[PDB]
From a paper:
The human fibroblast growth factor receptor ([name]) family of proteins (FGFR1-4) contain an extracellular domain, a transmembrane domain, and a cytoplasmic kinase domain. The [name] family has critical roles in development and tissue repair through the initiation of multiple signaling cascades controlling proliferation, migration and survival. The [name] signal pathway is activated through FGF binding to the extracellular domain of [name], resulting in dimerization of [name] molecules. Aberrant [name] signaling pathways, resulting from gene mutation, amplification or overexpression, play an important role in the proliferation, survival and metastasis of a variety of cancer cells.
The electron density of [name] is well-defined in the crystal structure except for the ethanol group, which appears to be flexible even in the protein-bound state. Part of the activation loop (amino acids 634–650, not included in the coordinates of the final model) exhibits no electron density, indicating that this region is flexible. In the [name]/[name] complex, [name] only occupies the ATP-binding site, and does not induce any conformational changes, which indicates that [name] is a Type I inhibitor for [name]. Apparently, upon [name] binding, the [name] kinase domain was kept in DFG-in conformation. [name] binds to the ATP pocket of [name] through extensive interactions. The indazolyl ring forms two hydrogen bonds with residues in the N-terminal Hinge region, one with the main-chain carbonyl group of glutamic acid (Glu551) and the other with the main-chain amide of alanine (Ala553). The dichloropyridinyl ring forms a hydrogen bond with the side chain of asparagine (Asn557) in the C-terminal Hinge region. Moreover, [name] in the ATP-binding pocket adopts a chair-like conformation that folds up on the hydrophobic residue Leu619 in the C-lobe making five hydrophobic contacts, and exhibiting remarkable shape and chemical complementarities between the small molecular drug and the kinase protein. In particular, key [name]-binding residues of [name], such as Glu551, Ala553, Asn557 and Leu619, are all conserved in FGFR1-3, suggesting that the binding mode of [name] to FGFR1-4 may be conserved in FGFR1-3.
Residue numbers in the entry: 453 to 507, 511 to 570, 583 to 633, 651 to 750
Write the structure that this text describes.
């Protein structure tokens, strides 16, 4: 419908859509080839992802997400906005393409037969996700859902948090699960769960426990055990994230600093 933004408007003519990528609630995402995305070289073709409506009240969320992405600006560890097609019919939101898919699938696809994903790589994944979450928090933005399937992997193993904005019960903090309140510290609880997903190479949280009585065990002070071959330093981080009192869990800065110290152990 309305405005035309000269910092972001990109012509349909140099966008040829490709094969779908997935989901997601807000609309289908499709691979696409864009021409001249870097106006330095207007030849330099590149692979981008395009978010569209399916065909709506989702038009409101789609425009809303686009405007949010403009506000936050770039960062290494989020899916960044590249341009928008508002001018000749259907809305297109062009964002960067993570070639290796989501992090849980990246992990599961390279699992041993039992007992590549060396220890620096997995620490590198956790460090990058912590850096992206700290940045989103610093822009007063947030991403409740945070789970390994919410994280995308580029061709060069850069982690990018998909979507952010200004049911998944095994990732939710107690106060969000029961009091329906969400803060940065409840993200830290979810990041702890994501940490466990990473060092189980894409495992399912609380294996075997159906999605009910989980809450009673959390009230008993129980939490998932240390996964195999996970060093005690990283399990310590996980359990600090799973402290019941929100102010006793670490902030994303402290998680950044602790993970960075683990990366430096080289
Ligand atoms: C619903 C979908 O949203 C997005 C949003 C922005 C994106 N930029 N780039 C990708 C690449 C997705 C992909 C899927 N598979 N592969 C390898 C093989 O094709 C690549 C992508 C996906 C999704 C999916 Cl598709 C997966 N996990 C999380 C989410 Cl949010």
């Amino acid at each position: 419908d309305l405005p035309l933004d000269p910092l972001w408007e990109f012509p349909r003519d140099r966008l040829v859509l490709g094969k779908p990528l997935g989901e997601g609630a807000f609309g289908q995402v499709v691979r696409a080839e864009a021409f001249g995305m870097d106006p330095a070289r207007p030849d330099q073709a590149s692979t981008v992802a395009v978010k569209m409506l399916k065909d709506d009240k989702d038009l409101a969320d789609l425009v809303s997400e686009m405007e949010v992405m403009k506000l936050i600006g770039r960062h290494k560890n989020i899916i960044n906005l590249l341009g928008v097609c508002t001018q000749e019919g259907p809305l297109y939101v062009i964002v960067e393409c993570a070639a290796k898919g989501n992090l849980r699938e990246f992990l599961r696809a390279r699992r041993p037969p039992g007992p590549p994903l060396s220890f620096p790589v997995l620490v590198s994944c956790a460090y990058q996700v912590a850096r992206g979450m700290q940045y989103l928090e610093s822009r007063k933005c947030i991403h409740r859902d945070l789970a390994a399937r919410n994280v995308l992997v580029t061709e060069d193993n850069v982690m990018k948090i998909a979507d952010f904005g200004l049911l998944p019960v095994k990732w939710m903090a107690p106060e969000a699960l029961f009091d329906r309140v969400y803060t940065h510290q409840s993200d830290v609880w979810s990041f702890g769960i994501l940490l466990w997903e990473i060092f189980t190479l894409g495992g399912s949280p609380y294996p075997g426990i159906p999605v009910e009585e989980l809450f009673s065990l959390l009230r008993e002070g129980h939490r998932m055990d240390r996964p195999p071959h996970c060093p005690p330093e990283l399990y310590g981080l996980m359990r600090e994230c799973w402290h019941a009192a929100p102010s006793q869990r670490p902030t994303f800065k402290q998680l950044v600093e602790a993970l960075d110290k683990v990366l430096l152990a080289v």
